[PDB]
Amino acid sequence: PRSLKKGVFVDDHLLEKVLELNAKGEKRLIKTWSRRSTIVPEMVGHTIAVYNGKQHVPVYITENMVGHKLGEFAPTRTYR
Amino acid sequence: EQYYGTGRRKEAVARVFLRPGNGKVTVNGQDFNEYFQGLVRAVAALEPLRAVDALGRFDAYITVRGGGKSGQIDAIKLGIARALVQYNPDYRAKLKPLGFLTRDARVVERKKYGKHKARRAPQYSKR
Amino acid sequence: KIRIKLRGFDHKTLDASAQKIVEAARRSGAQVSGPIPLPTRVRRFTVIRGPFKHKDSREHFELRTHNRLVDIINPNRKTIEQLMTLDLPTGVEIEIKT
Amino acid sequence: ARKALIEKAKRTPKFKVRAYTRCVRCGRARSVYRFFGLCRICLRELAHKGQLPGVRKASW
Amino acid sequence: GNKIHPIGFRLGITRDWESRWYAGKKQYRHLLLEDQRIRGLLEKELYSAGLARVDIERAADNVAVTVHVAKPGVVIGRGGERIRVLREELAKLTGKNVALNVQEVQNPNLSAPLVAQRVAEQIERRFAVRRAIKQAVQRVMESGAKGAKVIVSGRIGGAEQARTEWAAQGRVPLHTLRANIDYGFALARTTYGVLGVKAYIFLGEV
Amino acid sequence: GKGDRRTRRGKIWRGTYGKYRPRK
Amino acid sequence: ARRRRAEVRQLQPDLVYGDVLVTAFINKIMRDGKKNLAARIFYDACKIIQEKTGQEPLKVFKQAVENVKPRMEVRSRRVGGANYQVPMEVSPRRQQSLALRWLVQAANQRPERRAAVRIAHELMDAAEGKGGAVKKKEDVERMAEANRAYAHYRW
RNA sequence: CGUCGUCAGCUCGUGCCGUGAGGUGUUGGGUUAAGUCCCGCAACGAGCGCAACCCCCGCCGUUAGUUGCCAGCGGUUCGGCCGGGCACUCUAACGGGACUGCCCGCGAAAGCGGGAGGAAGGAGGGGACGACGUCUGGUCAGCAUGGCCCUUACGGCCUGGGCGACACACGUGCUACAAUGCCCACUACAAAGCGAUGCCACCCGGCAACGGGGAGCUAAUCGCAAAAAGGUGGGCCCAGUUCGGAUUGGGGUCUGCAACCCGACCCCAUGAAGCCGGAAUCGCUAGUAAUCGCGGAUCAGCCAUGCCGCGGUGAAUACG
Ligand SMILES: [K+]
Ligand SMILES: [K+]
Ligand SMILES: [Mg+2]
Ligand SMILES: [Mg+2]
Ligand SMILES: [Mg+2]
Ligand SMILES: [Mg+2]
Ligand SMILES: [Mg+2]
Ligand SMILES: [Mg+2]
Ligand SMILES: [Mg+2]
Ligand SMILES: [Mg+2]
Ligand SMILES: [Mg+2]
Ligand SMILES: [Mg+2]
Ligand SMILES: [Mg+2]
Ligand SMILES: [Mg+2]
Ligand SMILES: [Mg+2]
Ligand SMILES: [Mg+2]
Ligand SMILES: [Mg+2]
Ligand SMILES: [Mg+2]
Ligand SMILES: [Mg+2]
Ligand SMILES: [Mg+2]
Ligand SMILES: [Mg+2]
Ligand SMILES: [Mg+2]
Ligand SMILES: [Mg+2]
Ligand SMILES: [Mg+2]
Ligand SMILES: [Mg+2]
Ligand SMILES: [Mg+2]
Ligand SMILES: [Mg+2]
Ligand SMILES: [Mg+2]
Ligand SMILES: [Mg+2]
Ligand SMILES: [Mg+2]
Ligand SMILES: [Mg+2]
Ligand SMILES: [Mg+2]
Ligand SMILES: [Mg+2]
Ligand SMILES: [Mg+2]
Ligand SMILES: [Mg+2]
Ligand SMILES: [Zn+2]
Structure with missing residues (x-):
């Protein structure tokens, strides 16, 4: 039962920093602190380093995860 | 012609207007039984009349506001009790002994702090 | 035919204010609607007595606001004079519409 | 109430949300009333002094 | 740690407030903060005079501050120099043309x-x-x-x-x-x- | 019971409204 | 009750039979202060005993009660490192209490789905000399007596 | 501030007694809820506590009518709507009321039992109020404060994370295990409160949450607001079941810069444990307990089933 409304939120920090990295092909890594941002189509194929609070984690974003958030892939706590 | 009282119970007041007639009773524009739809208590309200063989010589128009049905039932009991003596002080002599003329003072006791509700105190363990 | 409102925190500051008006304009205007007592609106504050823990003590404080009406009909000429500028109560506030 | 933190007064919140109240008398953020801009402690104190007009000891 | 303030306990009777002014949920908090700020400079100043109380009546941009003291002279000043400086310091804090009576303690x-x-x-x-x-x-x-x-x-x-x-x-x-x-x-x-x-x-x- | 959000009591208890308890 | 001896609450006569003992039984039936719901249950039962029986419900009532009152019971006590079931006579006030309580208790043990039926049957079933309410009453008396050896501990 | 504990009791002055610490008074007999009052007494009084003075509830009255009403009448789009009137209900200021005063019985008294009249009867019910002191109680993280200690960091700013981890254990609660019940209709009856960029009538759209439009209120006058338990009718028929709503999959709506960690809400699907709970243990003496719903503070929103209040229905029992 998830929901935002109308305006699939995305911090432009990386957006206009990825939609641009599309023009000159692709790239290698984009470390961000904005795990708030929603993953979107034009991200597929990229690799975003998401800060979990102590480190930036490598995340090869794929089609199957186009609707999820970035934090969802950078687990916060360390357990057993 | 007319005879008034009032009667109050658990914070519920009622206008009791007695008049010579059959036994018709209008409560907020409804038949006694129309208002007290199946509430075994009801009968009580008119008890003051039966006390003095009345009912079969009187009629009553009642207005009521505040509280709840059973509280209103009692307000009416006191109103009708007062109105009856308003029509004849000699009614006290035998109407009083049955209490009818007393206002029930007991009301919802205040909710104190530290308790769960006035008296119910919180549950404590390993004391 | 003036409608005046009298609110406050002291119930004697308003009685010595609604009558401060009526009696005056009671000899120059209509016989007035007398002072009408509008119900009060109470504001409660409940506080834990001590600074730390002890969430079972608490003390109760209320800020009750009293109200009045008066309401004199016949906005006469000799009325707005015995009144107008002869105020006294200081903890009162006044509204006027008619 | 670290002086540095009583910077709350700083309109500039960047985002209206982040703006929160604080006791105007002790800086206490944890239990401040709106109608007084005072926390439950400072409030109890001044009320006792009689410096809070109209405010009395409620009993019933 | 028991017993309540003997004054706050007696505000109903045998004891009046130190601030007499009505207000609404929009002003009260302000006229209060200020009303305090007043007692702020005042008590930090008039100390020597020996200020026993500071009543504050209000009406509408009107402030009936009434500094009670034992030495009403430290309030005044030379001829009337202090009750001039301060009386100005007040209206400076809050632009509200503030009075400033002064009473002696019998x-x-x-x-x-x-x-x-x-x-x-x-x-x-x-x-x-x-x-x-x-x-x-x-x-x-x-x-x-x-x-x-x-x-x-x-x-x-x-x-x-x-x-x-x-x-x-x-x-x-x-x-x-x-x-x-x-x-x-x-x-x-x-x-x-x-x-x-x-x-x-x-x-x-x- | 009061815990059934798809019932009258459910809504009332949770002080909400919806299909199972619309505003009159 | 350390100071006085608590006077008994005097109840309001029945709305129908003008009986105080009825109000009691009703009260015991009642739970969560639903005196209306209570009263009805008893009454419907009265009409059920009125049908399946030719006798008047009020009288059937009285009888059952009388049959379920215990005249003796054992009250436990401490005596030199040991607890003893001391037979004790049973106070009239307490009899009526135990009787009315038991009926209702037993009644709600019955299998019949409808409340009033359960009260109905249990009540009439009681006046007949049978029923779980009466069995309790008997077990209690059997409990007492059966410890008459500890009767000298009068209490 | 908590606590012993609203438990009474803790003391002083002078006198008297004792070498002295100290004692007497405050012990004793009667009586109270009370060191409450009476009687006695080498003591006579007093102070802090009891009590009373303050608040709420219960009966009545006097000013005072933008909320009551055919009460009585004239109009009726039968809505107290309009005219009209303050009687009534209320609203809120001020007073009256109870004193063991009266009668009987018992006392020596204070008082005790009982009876009348009274709304109320012997502290009418609830509250505020908690002595000298005890716990080296609690709080340096509300604030204030002596002393120590850091002063490109033990100060300051951000972005992100954590305070929301989990094999597991306990406290306090919530919702239940059902027929004195659950569901869907229809219809009743409250009290306190809160609301001008805030309550939000009504209308339209949507299953709905909610969107769009929009009247009204500075609010006894408009809104929150439905009262729920009840009452009436109908369904379920004893089953883990039309009990119970955990968990999980979807699809949405709001607040907010932003709901992954970590929001509430709606709708569909899912439909867990649970059949009344071992040893042990908590509350409450009556409008109390038990039940039912309603408001508020904080607050954008909310993790409130928590607190703090409000009113409806309304028991059982106390030998001792
Ligand atoms: K200490
Ligand atoms: K389960
Ligand atoms: Mg209640
Ligand atoms: Mg608690
Ligand atoms: Mg608390
Ligand atoms: Mg500081
Ligand atoms: Mg905030
Ligand atoms: Mg705050
Ligand atoms: Mg269900
Ligand atoms: Mg006492
Ligand atoms: Mg001496
Ligand atoms: Mg000696
Ligand atoms: Mg000597
Ligand atoms: Mg001495
Ligand atoms: Mg002594
Ligand atoms: Mg002594
Ligand atoms: Mg002695
Ligand atoms: Mg004394
Ligand atoms: Mg004594
Ligand atoms: Mg003596
Ligand atoms: Mg310590
Ligand atoms: Mg400790
Ligand atoms: Mg320090
Ligand atoms: Mg925590
Ligand atoms: Mg673990
Ligand atoms: Mg809970
Ligand atoms: Mg629609
Ligand atoms: Mg979140
Ligand atoms: Mg099972
Ligand atoms: Mg079953
Ligand atoms: Mg008790
Ligand atoms: Mg609530
Ligand atoms: Mg909120
Ligand atoms: Mg949560
Ligand atoms: Mg809530
Ligand atoms: Zn504060």
Whole structure:
């Protein structure tokens, strides 16, 4: 039962920093602190380093995860 | 012609207007039984009349506001009790002994702090 | 035919204010609607007595606001004079519409 | 109430949300009333002094 | 740690407020903060005069500040120089054309706040606490009063073991409402720490 | 019971409204 | 009750039979102060005993009660490192209490789905000398007596 | 501030007694809820506590009518709507009322039992109020404060994370295990409160949450607001079941810069444990307990089933 409304939120920090990295092909890594941002189509194929609070984690974003958030892939706590 | 009282119970007041007639009773524009739809208590309200063989010589128009049905039932009991003596002080002599003329003072006791509700105190363990 | 409102925190500051008006304009205007007592609106504050823990003590404080009406009909000429500028109560506030 | 933190007064919140109240008398953020801009402690104190007009000891 | 403020307890009767002004949920908090800010500069200034109370009446941009003191002269100044400077300092803080009456105390030995201040001072001047107390209780008892009582906190004479000195005469019924007991608290900064003075003065009843 | 959000009591208890308890 | 001896609450006569003992039984039936719901239950039962029986419900009632009152019971006590079931006579006030309580208790043990039926049957079933309410009453008396050896501990 | 504990009790002055610590008074007999009052007494009084003075509830009255009403009448779009009137109900200021005063019985008294008149009867019910002191109680993280300690960091700013981890254990609660019940209709009866960029009538759209439009109120006058338990009718028929709503999959709506960690809400699907709970243990003496719903503070929103209040229905029992 998830929901935002109308305006699939995305911090432009990386957006206009990825939609641009599309023009000159692709790239290698984009470390961000904005795990708030929603993953979107034009991200597929990229690799975003998401800060979990102590480190930036490598995340090869794929089609199957186009609707999820970035934090969802950078687990916060360390357990057993 | 007319005879008034009032009667109050658990914070519920009622206008009791007695008049010579059959036994018709209008409560907020409804038949006694129309208002007290199946509430075994009801009968009580008119008890003051039966006390003095009345009912079969009187009629009553009642207005009521505040509280709840059973509280209103009692307000009416006191109103009708007062109105009856308003029509004849000699009614006290035998109407009083049955209490009818007393206002029930007991009301919802205040909710104190530290308790769960006035008296119910919180549950404590390993004391 | 003036409608005046009298609110406050002291119930004697308003009685010595609604009558401060009526009696005056009671000899120059209509016989007035007398002072009408509008119900009060109470504001409660409940506080834990001590600074730390002890969430079972608490003390109760209320800020009750009293109200009045008066309401004199016949906005006469000799009325707005015995009144107008002869105020006294200081903890009162006044509204006027008619 | 670290002086540095009583910077709350700083309109500039960047985002209206982040703006929160604080006791105007002790800086206490944890239990401040709106109608007084005072926390439950400072409030109890001044009320006792009689410096809070109209405010009395409620009993019933 | 029991017993309520003897004043806050007596605001209904035998005791009026120190601020008489109506307000609504939109102003109250402000006219309050200010109303306080006033007592701020005031009490930090008029100290020497010996300010026992500061009533504040309001009407509408009108401020009826009434500084009560024992030495109404320290308020005024040379001819009338202070009650000019300050009276201007006030309207400077809050642009509200503020008045600023001044009253003398018919006996500063019946001003609980003062008695506290007095004793509280002697403490910083390193006096013998018990003496001060007994004395104060005397002054008050002498110049009228049906009862009186002073209380000092602890670390008396720089002692490591904080204590509490007593002293009192005549009636001082904190429980009876219609008592009319003035009360005053005086602090007491020191080379070794804080002490606390409390003054109680019982006068008349009904 | 009061814990069944798809019932009258459910809504009332949770002080909400919806299909199972619309505003009259 | 350390000071006085608590006077017994005097109840309001029945709305129908003008009986105080009825109000009691009703009260015991009642739970969560639903005196209306209570009253009805008893009454419907009265009409059920009125049908399946030719006798008047009020009288059937009285009887059952009378049959379920215990005249003896054992009250436990401490005596030199040991607890003893001391037979004790049973106070009239307490009898009526135990009787009315038991009926209702037993009644709600019955299998019949409808409340009033359960009260109905249990009540009439009681006046007949049978029923779980009466069995309790008997077990209690059997409990007492059966410890008459500890009767000298009068209490 | 908590606590012993609203438990009574803790003391002083002078006198008297004792070498002295100290004692007497405050012990004793009667009586109270009370060191409450009486009687006695080498003591006579007083202070802090009891009590009383303050608040709420219960009966009545006097000013005072933008909320009551055919009460009585004239109009009727039968809505107290309009005219009209303050009687009534209320609203809120001020007073009256109870004193063991009266009668009987018992006392020596204080008082005790009982009876009348009274709304109320012997502290009418609830609250505020908690003595000298005890716990080296609690709080240096509300604030204040002596002393120590850091002063490109033990100060300051951000972005992100954590305070929301989990094999597991306990406290306090919530919702239940059902027929004195659950569901859907229809219809009743409250009290306190809160609301001008805030309550939000009504209308339209949507299953709905909610969107769009929009009247009204500075609010006894408009809104929150439905009262729920009840009452009436109908369904379920004893089943883990039309009990119970945990968990999980979807699809949405709001607040907010932003709901992954970590929001509430709606709708569909899912439909867990649970059949009344071992040893042990908590509350409450009556409008109390038990049940039912309603408001508020904080607050954008909310993790409130928590607190703090409000009113409806309304028991059982106390030998001792
Ligand atoms: K200590
Ligand atoms: K489960
Ligand atoms: Mg209740
Ligand atoms: Mg608690
Ligand atoms: Mg708390
Ligand atoms: Mg600081
Ligand atoms: Mg905030
Ligand atoms: Mg805050
Ligand atoms: Mg269900
Ligand atoms: Mg006591
Ligand atoms: Mg002596
Ligand atoms: Mg000797
Ligand atoms: Mg000697
Ligand atoms: Mg002595
Ligand atoms: Mg002694
Ligand atoms: Mg002694
Ligand atoms: Mg002795
Ligand atoms: Mg005494
Ligand atoms: Mg005694
Ligand atoms: Mg003596
Ligand atoms: Mg310690
Ligand atoms: Mg400890
Ligand atoms: Mg320090
Ligand atoms: Mg935590
Ligand atoms: Mg673990
Ligand atoms: Mg809970
Ligand atoms: Mg629609
Ligand atoms: Mg979140
Ligand atoms: Mg199972
Ligand atoms: Mg079953
Ligand atoms: Mg008790
Ligand atoms: Mg709630
Ligand atoms: Mg909120
Ligand atoms: Mg949560
Ligand atoms: Mg809630
Ligand atoms: Zn504060």
